[PDB]
Design a binder for these strands. Structure first.
Ligand SMILES: [Zn+2]
Lengths: 638, 133
DNA sequence: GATATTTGATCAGGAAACGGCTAGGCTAGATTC
DNA sequence: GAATCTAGCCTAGCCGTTTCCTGATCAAATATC
């Protein structure tokens, strides 16, 4: 009897029979308030909520001025929906004052993910949590209380924070990190009892225990590493680091038991190395991937090609089982109809959520290739990242608008749409191009260059917020700011530059150009902090001018190069006979960690067995890659 | 041993060890009858990035012979590979008209790649000049 | 036959590719008071 | 029934190595009919 209202057959089947009449009862008022039919269908898992939103909705808007329809439906479709809303109406008045001072978004998040019990617990104990002897930031309280299982993590924290932080000895933040995830009460109770046993008998550091106890599903990984560690270590031959890595994910218990039961079978029958098995099992849902591999390896490697290395590559990442099952079905259709090379399919499927990307590619290839003028290679490039489905839909929707209103060529849109989070970069560009192109003075090409990288939205917002201060209070030019923000992680680099420029310039005698050069690479902030920490020691204990340190740090991965130089300078200089100039020449042409260790490991045999002076090997490793030029060509062909 | 430059006789001087970046010494005759020398190091910014040779040792000296309008000179270097196949085609183009240059590799150079040479050569300039970048 | 057209060669240095790890959200089934 | 505890599957954002691409001039040099 729902057809007369406007509900289709598909929507009618979703609604349970025993609630259908109630949907008919409150339809007029719900639509009168501005609710779409899909919203009404969604707000039906909790039938009693259909009686609240219709009856009282003006008070909901009055108490929560910025709330929208989607958030209200999401709050009211949970296991305790009506009661959470009615408690919000009576609590939001007091909860907006001291000592918490929460906003609408935090209230809606805590209600939706914790229920009436969580909101009442936060209201009741809002004074003891912030005050001594706890001193908790409101954000930490919100994070703890925004998980299924609230009103139990808060009390357990209130009881166990001093005892854990005094007797055993942990940083305040580690307890909050443990208690943030679901079921944190059990994790805290288990860690309090099992920390000494693991830290004394099995020789594990407390940081490892915290790392493997800070995931949803705890109290089970800890109880499993306390029993299966010696058997795996001695019978199978795995180092404790591999066991910890396996057990440090969701459902680590199942992964540990599955590995213990399936390692010999895979290592003997199907011909796989243990490292590959550990790599497959070191992710979420590892046991499903292991079982799917054991079942589908012979079929996929005899009828479709797909050498075992490619199968192992697909099997990794979260949800490997879904990717394998989707590939086994969609390989012939994609290869024969649309004309896609199998390695392209393998590249598409070797990412998180590859099943969705494959289905979206199959559905959207003809429209994109026959209604917007795009080659198949561009579509493959778009859908070869994390979230390719969203990027494909966003580019399909937004290509004509960007190509007509703002005069952007399709190649620029393709460049933006790639990477991770391409959709967010596309919407940010559409919103912020006019603002940046007339006020700050940037050209469209500079904005496109900024946005064509991972995390482009953050870089654009940070540039829009920090351009005048850096360009006026520190003497920097806009081109240098664009150069800093071009690479990945531009927000961190810009913030670190603003925070650390005066200190480095006044206390270490560094010109602004050197600071800009250091912070214009991948991971610039780490290089800046490492330079600040390591400059005095590397220039006093060992003879080293600041220019040499800058040269070492002005490359991708300079932090590792600086640490390795500080650790390996004396042994290489004394036990092998190399001038420090040669070490800083090796550690300044990219890489800088592989090359130095390779030189140390290969110097004796290459100098003695073959007959090359240390000068020749230093010259070989200096300019170029180093590791690939020493391991092969010289130490393999000869 | 010794090479002829005007009335003087110049032998091979001392050069740093080969660490992957080439160094060189250039000798010429000033407009007095004397002898002058200058040092060169590979790499660095160049006004002609389109030419591969314009960043090498045996071509920065060639360009220096053109900026000041010198006629004869002599260069050394310390690479146990010789002159690459790019310079043996481009030095004449970069050199001004009727300019003579000699490049002396270190003793024992064994070329390995295609186009490399391990013997002293004489370069004579031609009328053409470099194209603007 | 004479011939046309592909064949590499850096003593450089910026992009562009290809791996890998952290942090956070949402949904469905199972278990305890 | 009410309230809490586990297992898998998806998106954004950030940090380290390794391989590819330019302009340019001159010999030999497969294809070549
Ligand atoms: Zn050369």
């Amino acid at each position: 009897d729902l057809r007369t209202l406007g509900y289709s057959q598909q929507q009618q089947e979703k609604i349970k029979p025993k609630v259908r009449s109630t949907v008919a009862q409150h339809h007029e008022a719900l639509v009168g308030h501005g609710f779409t039919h899909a919203h009404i269908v969604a707000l039906s898992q909790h039938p009693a909520a259909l009686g609240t939103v219709a009856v009282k909705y003006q008070d909901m808007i009055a108490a929560l001025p910025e709330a929208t329809h989607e958030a209200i439906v999401g709050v009211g479709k949970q296991w305790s929906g009506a009661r959470a809303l009615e408690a919000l109406l009576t609590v939001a008045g007091e909860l907006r004052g001291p000592p918490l001072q929460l906003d609408t978004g935090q209230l809606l998040k805590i209600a939706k993910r914790g229920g009436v019990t969580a909101v009442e617990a936060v209201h009741a104990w809002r004074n003891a949590l912030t005050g001594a002897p706890l001193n908790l930031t409101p954000e930490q309280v919100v994070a703890i209380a925004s998980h299924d299982g609230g009103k139990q993590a808060l009390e357990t924290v209130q009881r166990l924070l001093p005892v854990l932080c005094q007797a055993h000895g942990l940083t305040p933040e580690q307890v909050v990190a443990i208690a943030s995830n679901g079921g944190g009460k059990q994790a805290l109770e288990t860690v309090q009892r099992l920390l000494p046993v693991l830290c004394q008998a099995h020789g594990l550091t407390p940081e490892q225990v915290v790392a493997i106890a800070s995931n949803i599903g705890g109290k089970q990984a800890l109880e499993t590493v306390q029993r299966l560690l010696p058997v795996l270590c001695q019978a199978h031959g795995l180092t404790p680091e591999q066991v910890v890595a396996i057990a440090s994910n969701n459902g680590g218990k199942q992964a540990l038991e599955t590995v213990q039961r399936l390692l010999p079978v895979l290592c003997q029958a199907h011909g796989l190395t243990p490292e590959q098995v550990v790599a497959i099992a070191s992710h979420d849902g590892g046991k499903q991937a292991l079982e799917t591999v054991q079942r589908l390896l012979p079929v996929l490697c005899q009828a479709h090609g797909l050498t075992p290395e490619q199968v192992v590559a697909i099997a990794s990442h979260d949800g490997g089982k879904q990717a394998l099952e989707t590939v086994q079905r969609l390989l012939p259709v994609l290869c024969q109809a649309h004309g896609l090379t199998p390695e392209q399919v393998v590249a598409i499927a070797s990412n998180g959520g590859g099943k969705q990307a494959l289905e979206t590619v199959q559905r959207l290839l003809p429209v994109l290739c026959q209604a917007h003028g795009l080659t198949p290679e561009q579509v493959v490039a778009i859908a070869s990242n994390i979230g390719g489905k969203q990027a494909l839909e966003t580019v399909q929707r937004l290509l004509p608008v960007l190509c007509q209103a703002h005069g952007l060529t399709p190649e620029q849109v393709v460049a933006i749409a790639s990477n991770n989070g391409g959709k967010q970069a596309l919407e940010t560009v559409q919103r912020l191009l006019p603002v940046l192109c007339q006020a700050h003075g940037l050209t469209p090409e500079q904005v496109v260059a900024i946005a064509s990288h991972d995390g482009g939205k953050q870089a654009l917002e940070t540039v829009q917020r920090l351009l005048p201060v850096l360009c006026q209070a520190h003497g920097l030019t806009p081109e240098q700011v664009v150069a800093i923000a071009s690479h990945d992680g531009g927000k961190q680099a810009l913030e670190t530059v603003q925070r650390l420029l005066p200190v480095l310039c006044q206390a270490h005698g560094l010109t602004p150009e050197q600071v800009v050069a250091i912070a214009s690479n991948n991971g610039g902030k780490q290089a800046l902090e490492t330079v600040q920490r390591l400059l005095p020691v590397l220039c006093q204990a060992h003879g080293l001018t600041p220019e040499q340190v800058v040269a070492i740090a002005s490359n991708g991965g300079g932090k590792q190069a600086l640490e390795t130089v500080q650790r390996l300078l004396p042994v290489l200089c004394q036990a092998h006979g190399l001038t420090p100039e040669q070490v800083v020449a090796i550690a300044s042409n990219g890489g800088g960690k592989q090359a130095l260790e390779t030189v140390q490991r290969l110097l004796p045999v290459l100098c003695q067995a073959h007959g090359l002076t240390p000068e020749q090997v230093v010259a070989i490793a200096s300019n170029g890659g180093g590791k690939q030029a020493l391991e092969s060509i010289v130490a393999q062909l000869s | 041993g010794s090479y002829a430059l005007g009335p003087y006789q110049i032998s091979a001087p001392q050069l740093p060890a080969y660490n992957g970046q080439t160094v060189g010494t250039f000798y010429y005759v000033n407009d007095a009858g004397g002898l002058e020398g200058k040092v060169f190091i590979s790499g660095g910014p160049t006004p002609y990035p389109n030419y591969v040779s314009a960043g090498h040792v045996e071509s920065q000296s060639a360009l220096f012979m053109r900026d000041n309008g010198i006629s004869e000179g002599l260069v050394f270097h310390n690479n146990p590979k010789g002159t690459c196949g790019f310079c043996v085609n481009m030095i004449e183009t970069l050199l001004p008209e009727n300019a003579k240059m000699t490049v002396v590799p270190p003793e024992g150079v064994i070329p390995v790649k295609r186009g490399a040479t391990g013997e002293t050569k004489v370069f004579i300039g031609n009328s053409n000049g470099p194209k603007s970048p």
